[PDB]
């Protein structure tokens, strides 16, 4: 039940500093190594440093002079600060559990629980939060439109998660705009159509906008 | 210099087995590596690790259909009765001397599976966009397989060219595919013709949607 939760800005400037922290729940970050990796949108995965709060950090040396690492005890959190970023830091970036150091010194290497990934972009340009549109309906399509929006991503979840079947949230697309729309899509019996109500629930976090929509006939 | 090998891509069809590869730099041939699934869309989770001596211990849930296998400088990870959901990237791990390194992934293709036409929606612009002044066409696609179609706009009839965005498939949730397509167009456009269609074209066979205002 040990659970990591990355959590950061979605977004940041050419030559600012990221900063990201990891937050372990379930159990204690004492004893541990913990890494932190990142990934580019499609591309693989790359380490970038780890922490023992007792023992040592360390981190690629293709990325060392950028790259600071910490922990907060009290907080049960490791922290990444990676400064003078540029759009080659695009990218989700992660943290995990790592090698374990028993007392007496000697460990098990290990790297058994990954976070869920937090998606940073480098920009210049300003958050923009999403129109969202209703897609309008024996079974039937219906959906929302979530448009114009940055940077990435957006959750759509249908009926306050409480819809869990046909959904399908398609990849966004880049517009030339420079922003992102995507769909999200629900299949469902023609029969319920007079009867059960579809809201979808558009979250852009970068914006913190929280929008509900209701698909109707 | 610690370096992991994976050729980019490996393939077998459902319900085979598959051994992929990861190949330790010649100074490192003894190390333990760890294996990593990342499905599409999701982030990694951790499979197993692989010992020198050729043991390996799985994390917790993952499927016994995944074993893990050493020879010499190999690293393996054998995948047996392959389903759907093991389409995904896999890489490998390994701890050095204050560091860690992966290597490049290996996309594992599962072929052979079911095959399905796709089911097309075309929804017309909503009236909620329409008084925000702009259109979007949308045409959904889903339930195919496999994941490649190819999108043919038209209005009244004419080929449309300009304005269209069109996702690349990727897998829905009970492993078919989907796709979208976008056709931007503006209100007066939307409303001076008859209509427009969106064709599907997929191994061959080509499927029709139309929407007039």
């Known amino acids: 039940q040990v659970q990591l939760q990355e959590s950061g800005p979605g977004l940041v400037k050419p030559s600012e500093t990221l900063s990201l922290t990891c937050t372990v729940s379930?159990?204690?970050?004492?004893?541990?190594?913990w890494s932190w990796i990142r990934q580019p949108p499609g591309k693989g995965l790359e380490w970038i440093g780890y922490?023992?709060?007792?023992?040592?950090?360390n981190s690629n040396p293709a990325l060392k002079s950028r790259v600071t690492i910490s922990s907060d005890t009290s907080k049960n959190q490791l922290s990444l600060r990676l400064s003078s970023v540029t759009a080659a830091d695009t990218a989700v970036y992660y943290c995990?559990?790592?090698?374990?150091?028993?007392?007496?010194?000697?460990?098990?290497?290990?790297?058994?629980?990954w976070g869920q990934g937090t998606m940073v972009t480098v920009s210049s340009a300003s958050t923009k939060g999403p129109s969202v549109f209703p897609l309008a309906p024996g079974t039937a399509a219906l959906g929302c439109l979530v448009k114009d929006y940055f940077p990435e991503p957006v959750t759509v979840s249908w009926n306050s998660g409480a819809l869990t079947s046909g959904v399908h949230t398609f990849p966004a697309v880049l517009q030339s705009s420079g922003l992102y729309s995507l769909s999200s899509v629900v299949t469902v019996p023609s029969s319920s159509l007079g009867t059960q109500t579809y809201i979808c629930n558009v979250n852009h976090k970068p914006s913190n906008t929280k929008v509900d929509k209701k698909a109707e006939p | 210099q610690l370096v992991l090998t994976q050729s980019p891509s490996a393939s077998a069809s459902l319900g085979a087995s598959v051994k992929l590869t990861c190949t330790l730099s010649?100074?490192?041939?003894?190390?333990?590596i760890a294996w990593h699934q990342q499905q599409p869309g999701k982030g990694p989770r951790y499979l197993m690790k692989?010992?020198?001596?050729?043991?390996?211990i799985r994390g917790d849930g993952i499927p016994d259909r995944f074993s893990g296998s050493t020879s010499g400088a190999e690293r393996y990870l054998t995948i047996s009765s392959l389903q759907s959901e093991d389409e995904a990237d896999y890489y490998c791990?390994?701890?050095?001397?204050?560091?860690?390194?992966f290597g490049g992934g290996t996309k594992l293709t599962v072929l052979g599976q079911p095959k399905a036409a796709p089911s097309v929606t075309l929804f017309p612009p909503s009236s909620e966009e329409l008084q925000a002044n702009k259109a979007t066409l949308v045409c959904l696609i889903s339930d195919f397989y496999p994941g490649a179609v190819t999108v043919a706009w038209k209005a009244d009839g004419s080929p449309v060219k300009a304005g269209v965005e069109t996702t690349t498939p990727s897998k829905q949730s009970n492993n078919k595919y989907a796709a979208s397509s976008y056709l931007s167009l503006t209100p007066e456009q939307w409303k001076s013709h008859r209509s427009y269609s969106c064709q599907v074209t997929h191994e061959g066979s080509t499927v029709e949607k139309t929407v007039a205002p």
């Open positions: 791990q390994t701890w050095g001397a204050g560091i860690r390194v």
């Open positions: 379930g159990g204690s970050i004492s004893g541990y190594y």
């Open positions: 995990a559990r790592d090698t374990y150091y028993y007392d007496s010194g000697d460990y098990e290497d290990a790297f058994d629980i």
């Open positions: 922490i023992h709060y007792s023992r040592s950090t």
């Open positions: 010649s100074g490192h041939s003894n190390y333990a």
């Open positions: 692989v010992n020198r001596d050729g043991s390996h």
